[PDB]
Enzyme design. Structure first.
Site, PDB file in Angstrom:
ATOM      1  N   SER A 143       0.841  -1.221   0.000  1.00  0.00           N
ATOM      2  CA  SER A 143       0.000   0.000   0.000  1.00  0.00           C
ATOM      3  C   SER A 143       0.872   1.266   0.000  1.00  0.00           C
ATOM      4  CB  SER A 143      -1.010  -0.049   1.163  1.00  0.00           C
ATOM      5  OG  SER A 143      -2.058   0.927   0.989  1.00  0.00           O
ATOM      6  N   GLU A 235      -9.516  -3.258  -7.014  1.00  0.00           N
ATOM      7  CA  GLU A 235      -9.092  -2.178  -6.147  1.00  0.00           C
ATOM      8  C   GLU A 235      -8.906  -0.874  -6.866  1.00  0.00           C
ATOM      9  OE1 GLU A 235      -5.271  -2.184  -4.274  1.00  0.00           O
ATOM     10  OE2 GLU A 235      -4.777  -4.287  -4.697  1.00  0.00           O
ATOM     11  N   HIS A 265      -7.471  -4.840  -2.032  1.00  0.00           N
ATOM     12  CA  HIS A 265      -6.267  -4.193  -1.477  1.00  0.00           C
ATOM     13  C   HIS A 265      -5.513  -5.026  -0.430  1.00  0.00           C
ATOM     14  CE1 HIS A 265      -3.660  -0.745  -1.036  1.00  0.00           C
ATOM     15  NE2 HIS A 265      -3.981  -0.554   0.237  1.00  0.00           N
TER      16      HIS A 265
END
Length: 294
Positions: A143, A235, A265
């Protein structure tokens, strides 16, 4: 679509705070800690301090002498910790047969950009100084942390540091502008975002959202090591990984983009309940091992 991802997507949709309620940062941070998975009973952990930051060596069984992964956790550059990532990092260590250095780098808004990047680069330096050879190294993160893998590589390269054998960003947030088409097209499928814009605002604190160390999709990536890019089809950050792969290829870098059908995600984080999360972790590890055999 497996019965697990369906059950998980439903569970996540039920948990989510409605579109555009504003959760205070300290609430978000506590929430993330509170629901963190506990690492497996066979992961051994050692607290260290690196670059003035807390860290843990996170070691699954089977780890090889001389190998290490610098691991950069997600949390939008504003939250996350050693604790929130220890489970998933333990599994990556398992899959890769290498210990991971899990770094508690500086978070915004208390420490805006570029503090996180300073901390990752200094940790990489600290690894090199400990006597780990760059060819026995890898860098991975998820991320915000996946963008930071790339920012650290570019910054380290700029500072004359040698490159590791591989890097593996997981669902990377590599563009702070959040203008990619997938924020529209993948929004219905993505159960995990004015939220993300607030995160960019807090991290940047006025800095150029196209600064290459904030948004490595605008960076010169020439000279970077082989890359495995993991991203879910479902995502909002899809285009981040797709464009990252483009940039990488154009800049001469060996890049492998894997877009996982039906996945969300950092689906790896849900390895306890999601067979695909376990599978993607195994794949991460195989790729690190492939590149260490090269």
């Amino acid at each position: 679509a497996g019965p697990e991802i369906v059950k998980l997507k439903k569970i996540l949709r039920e948990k989510a705070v409605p579109p555009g309620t504003e959760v205070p940062l300290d609430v978000m941070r506590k929430g993330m800690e509170k629901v963190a998975f506990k690492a497996a009973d066979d992961i051994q952990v050692e607290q260290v301090t690196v670059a003035g930051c807390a860290a843990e060596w996170v070691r699954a069984p089977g780890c090889q002498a001389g190998k290490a992964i610098l691991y950069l956790h997600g949390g939008g550059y504003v939250m996350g910790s050693i604790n929130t990532h220890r489970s998933m990092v333990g599994e990556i260590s398992r899959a890769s047969q290498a210990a991971a250095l899990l770094l508690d780098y500086r978070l915004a808004p208390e420490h805006p950009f570029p503090a996180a990047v300073e901390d990752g680069v200094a940790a990489y330096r600290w690894l090199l100084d400990q006597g780990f050879k760059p060819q026995h190294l890898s860098i991975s993160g998820d991320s915000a942390g996946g963008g930071l893998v790339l920012a650290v590589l570019v910054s380290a390269r700029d500072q004359g540091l040698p490159m590791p054998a591989s890097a593996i960003p997981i669902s990377p947030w590599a563009d702070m502008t959040c203008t990619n088409d997938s924020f529209k097209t993948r929004a219905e499928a993505d159960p995990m975002p004015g939220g993300i814009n607030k995160m960019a605002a807090r991290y940047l604190n006025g800095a150029d959202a196209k600064h290459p160390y904030a948004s490595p999709n605008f960076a010169n990536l020439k000279g970077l090591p082989p890359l495995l890019i993991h991203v879910g089809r479902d995502e909002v950050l899809l285009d981040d990984s797709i464009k990252l792969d483009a940039k990488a290829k154009a800049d001469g870098v060996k890049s492998t983009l894997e877009i996982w059908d039906d996945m969300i995600h950092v689906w790896h984080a849900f390895h306890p309940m999601l067979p695909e999360g376990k599978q993607a972790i195994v794949r991460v590890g195989e790729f690190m091992r492939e590149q260490w055999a090269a």
